[PDB]
Amino acid sequence: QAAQSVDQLIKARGKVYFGVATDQNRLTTGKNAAIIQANFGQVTPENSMKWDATEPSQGNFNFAGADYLVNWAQQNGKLIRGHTLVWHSQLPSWVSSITDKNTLTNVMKNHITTLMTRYKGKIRAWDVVNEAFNEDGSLRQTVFLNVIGEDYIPIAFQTARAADPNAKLYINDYNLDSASYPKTQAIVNRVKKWRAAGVPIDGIGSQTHLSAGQGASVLQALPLLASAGTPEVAITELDVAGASSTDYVNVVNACLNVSSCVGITVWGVADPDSWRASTTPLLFDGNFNPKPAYNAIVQNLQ
Numbered sequence: 001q002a003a004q005s006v007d008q009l010i011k012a013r014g015k016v017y018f019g020v021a022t023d024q025n026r027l028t029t030g031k032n033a034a035i036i037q038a039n040f041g042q043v044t045p046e047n048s049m050k051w052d053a054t055e056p057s058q059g060n061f062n063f064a065g066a067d068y069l070v071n072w073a074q075q076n077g078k079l080i081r082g083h084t085l086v087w088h089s090q091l092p093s094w095v096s097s098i099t100d101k102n103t104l105t106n107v108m109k110n111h112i113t114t115l116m117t118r119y120k121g122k123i124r125a126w127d128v129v130n131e132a133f134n135e136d137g138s139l140r141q142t143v144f145l146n147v148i149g150e151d152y153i154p155i156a157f158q159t160a161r162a163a164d165p166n167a168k169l170y171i172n173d174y175n176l177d178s179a180s181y182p183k184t185q186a187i188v189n190r191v192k193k194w195r196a197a198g199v200p201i202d203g204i205g206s207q208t209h210l211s212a213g214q215g216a217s218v219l220q221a222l223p224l225l226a227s228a229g230t231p232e233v234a235i236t237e238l239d240v241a242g243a244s245s246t247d248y249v250n251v252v253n254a255c256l257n258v259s260s261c262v263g264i265t266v267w268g269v270a271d272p273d274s275w276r277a278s279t280t281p282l283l284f285d286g287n288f289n290p291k292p293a294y295n296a297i298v299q300n301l302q
Contacts, residue, residue, distance in 0.1 A: 001034050002290040002298075007041030009301035010263065013256060017042035017079050017263035021237070024048065024068045031288040032269050042079040042124075044236070044265050045069050049082055050090045055111055058094055063118060070119055081236070081265065082123045084172065085112050086156050087130040088142035096143045104147045109159045116163035125168040127205055127236070128160045129153055133173055137186025154199045161200040172205035172236055179220045191228040203230050207237035208251060209267070215240065215247030218254040226258045233260050237267040241279035245296035248283070252297055 007018040019042025026032040026046070036043065047053055048065030055061055073080050086108060088096075098104045116126065132153065134140050144152040153171075160169050171191065176184045187204065195201055204225050208218065218235075225233050235255055240247040255261035268274045270284040283294040 001031070001038035002294055004298045005039045005041075006294070006297055006301065007039060009298060010252075011041065013301060015255065015261070015263050017265075019043055019079065019081070019263065019265045020269055021046045021265065021267045022069070022269065024065050024072075026269065026273065027069075027072060030270070035269055035284065035288065036078070037076055040078070042081065042263065042265060043069065043073050044081045044083050046268070047090070049115065050084060051087065051095065051111065052090045052092050054115060056092055058107065059110075061114060066115075066119075070122055074122065079124045080119075080122065082115070082119065082126040082167070083236075084127040084130040085115065085160065086128060086144060086152070088140065088144070089131070091143070098143070099147055101148055104144070105152075105155065108144065108148070108152070108156065112156060112159045113163045116160060116167065120164045121166055123164070123167050125170055125203060125232075125234070126160060126164075127172040128156050128169050130172045131174065132171065133183050133187055135175065135183055137182040154194065154197070157194075157199050157201055168202040168232055169200055170203035170205045170232075170234070170236075171201055172207065174207035174209055174237070176204075176206040176225060177208060177210060177214060177221050178217045179224045181221075184221055184224060188224060188228045191230065195229060201230060203232040203234060203262075204228060205234050205236040207267075208235045208239075209237060210240045210247060210251075212240065212242040212244055212247065215244075215250030218251050219257070222254040222258050222261060226260045231260065232262050233258065234262050235264040238264055239267045239274060239276070239281040240293075241276070241281050243271075243281050243283070243291055243293050245293040248293040249296050249300050252300060
């Protein structure tokens, strides 16, 4: 654990949390648990709440990993973001073989309702729809789009709102890091249109998987995301190739500058456990010691 908590420091600046992705396999090995206890205020399950983990066979739900994380977080005073309900990746083949609109709609609604009702009142925010946009800003042609149509997004959010009215409902995506990117403009426009039609979208999540030197762009992109008029925005899956302090401090300052930015989640604790470990992109090194970027964030927040 680092001595100074970035979560406590960001809360002193008026934000809700600084958190991390984790799961049972992390929490039960190494120094992960102690680091999360001391330094972070929020957890996102890295894998245990995805469709493949939770409903591997239709109607045959598996909550073992998800329950472990929720209970651990509650015991340890950490906020939870649920991740993720509707996504084309980590989707079992029984779902993607369905070609009937009514069948898939009911499957999707049942998946949403079952997961959200189990944890009702315990989960601050859910990523309801993940990675719904192509890079040109059109909607990604996933099984949900192809079989249900564009209404799948409204249906997913309406169903989620009914299941747990206390949760903040997010749409989450990546490559929203530059204000001039086609995808960034498109998500803003479509979220404005959906909200004007009554769809309950409370948040835009920006994954923020950055390359070295790209942090500066977030200073301009995040205010543009906030212009869509959702109550919240968040940085949901931050990591930065090379872990330069300059990039990490820029992302934190972007969130500080945008009132509706509630917090930041970094996508893991220690470099070797990252999905792109070879780029050493996280705040703790392979020996579980804080990196200079951690200390730079602390100093920026003080």
